[PDB]
Amino acid sequence: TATLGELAEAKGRYFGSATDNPELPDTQYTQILGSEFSQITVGNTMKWQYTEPSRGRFDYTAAEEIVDLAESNGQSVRGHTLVWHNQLPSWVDDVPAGELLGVMRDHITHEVDHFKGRLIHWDVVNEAFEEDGSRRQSVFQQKIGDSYIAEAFKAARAADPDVKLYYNDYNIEGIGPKSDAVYEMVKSFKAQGIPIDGVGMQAHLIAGQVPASLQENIRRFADLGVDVALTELDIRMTLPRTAAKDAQQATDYGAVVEACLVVSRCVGITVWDYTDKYSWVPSVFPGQGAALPWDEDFAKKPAYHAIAAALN
């Protein structure tokens, strides 16, 4: 009957999926991508290695394709991601330390300016913290210092005043040292007048291990005055799939969706792609997989039933 996007929209939220250029040829895949979801995230081609492969020379070719596709289906789009220590072109490491801040600002200005007025959110900075809450020692942190995050948000706001600016990270779904650090940063930013409109909880979860404090965590961020979004939701399991594992995964998906629906400022959910066929999990987590609502043959799993039921 109604799609996840339609059910989500009926509750003032969006339900979308990330995608990547190489997948678009898959006709069965795109038909579902374009009809089931109300939002799309550019999976890879908005990343630094693609948009600015050589210093000062920008390339939005691949990203534009996905943005146009989303627009064609009437789907909103999330930009991902401007500042990240991963998938960074090699020339960035060679930039003299004293020049890096200026380079990061430039990268941000161009990309945000080019897509201005077409995206709903921008993941401005991604994974800037370690598990214990200390700063990840990336090229930006090391050469620019602690203010690089704040500078990144300022630059972004200066290039597009209407788009929502998000801080994105993983393992910040439950209350803990990592989410506390993000919590403090957001508090710090609000007090200093540093622009930031939301926190993106990637939500790359493990079946049977969903943080029970998820909802309370979403709520405290919302009380700080920022929106919250589950940006790259997937719940992996150790293969092979079994009925019991699928059922546990379904229960998990339902609890995650319910948590968002209970908090007024949880604007939406995005799954890191929607079919196991293209999930990034197997490639990064050896022995793990089957983390999405649709399996490799596009059959909806019990997980799908739970998501729809939670959305109502």
Ligand X SMILES: O[C@@H]1[C@@H](O)[C@H](O[C@@H]2CO[C@@H](O)[C@H](O)[C@H]2O)OC[C@H]1O
**Under the rule (CB under 6 A), what is the footprint of ligand X?**
43-44, 81, 86, 126-127, 170-171, 202, 204, 206, 232, 280
In Å, how far are 151, 245, 247, 260, 293 from 301, measured between CA atoms?
A: 43, 11, 9, 21, 6
Sequence-separated (6 or more) residues with CB below 8 Å from residue 38: 5, 6, 8, 9, 14, 15, 16, 74, 75, 76
In Å, how far are 26, 75, 97, 295 from 203, measured between CA atoms?
A: 26, 22, 33, 19
Instruction: Please state the closest distance from residue 42 (CB atom) to ligand X, in A.
Output: 10
* Residue 46 three-state SS: coil
Residue with smaller CB distance to Zn ion, 172 or 229: 172
Q: Binding Zn ion by CB under 5 A: which of 20, 23, 130, 180?
A: 180
C-beta nearest to ligand X: residue:
204
C-alpha span between 81 and 270 (Å, rounded): 15
CA distance between the termini of the chain: 12
Q: Binding Zn ion by CB under 5 A: which of 68, 113, 131, 216?
A: 68
Residue 171 interacts, among ligand X, Zn ion, none and using kind-specific CB cut-offs from 5 to 8 Å, with: ligand X
Choice among 36, 52, 127, 151 that is catalytic: 127
> Rule CB under 5 A: is residue 132 a binding residue for Zn ion?
no
Instruction: Please state the closest distance from residue 180 (CB atom) to ligand X, in A.
Output: 17
In order, the DSSP letters of 241-298 are P-HHHHHHHHHHHHHHHHHHHHSTTEEEEEESSSBGGG-SHHHHSTTEE--SSB-TTS
Q: Does the annotation mark 296 as catalytic? A: no
Residue 270 interacts, among ligand X, Zn ion, none and using kind-specific CB cut-offs from 5 to 8 Å, with: none
Residue with smaller CB distance to ligand X, 141 or 171: 171
Peptide bond into 22 cis (omega under 30): no
Peptide bond into 3 cis (omega under 30): no
Residue with smaller CB distance to ligand X, 43 or 174: 43
Instruction: Please state the closest distance from residue 172 (CB atom) to ligand X, in A.
Output: 11
Piece in contact with Zn ion (CB under 5 A), picked from 57-65, 197-205, 248-256, 279-287: 57-65
In Å, how far are 86, 120, 206, 255 from 285, measured between CA atoms?
A: 17, 31, 11, 23
Tokens standing for 202?
Answer: 């990637």
Residue 81 interacts, among Zn ion, ligand X, none and using kind-specific CB cut-offs from 5 to 8 Å, with: ligand X
Residue with smaller CB distance to ligand X, 154 or 204: 204
Q: Does the annotation mark 36 as catalytic? A: no
Residue with smaller CB distance to Zn ion, 94 or 297: 297
Return the residues of window 274-303 that contact Zn ion according to CB under 5 A.
295, 297, 299
C-alpha span between 194 and 151 (Å, rounded): 9
Catalytic residues: 127, 232
- What residues make contact with Zn ion under the rule CB under 5 A? 59, 61, 64, 68, 180, 295, 297, 299, 305
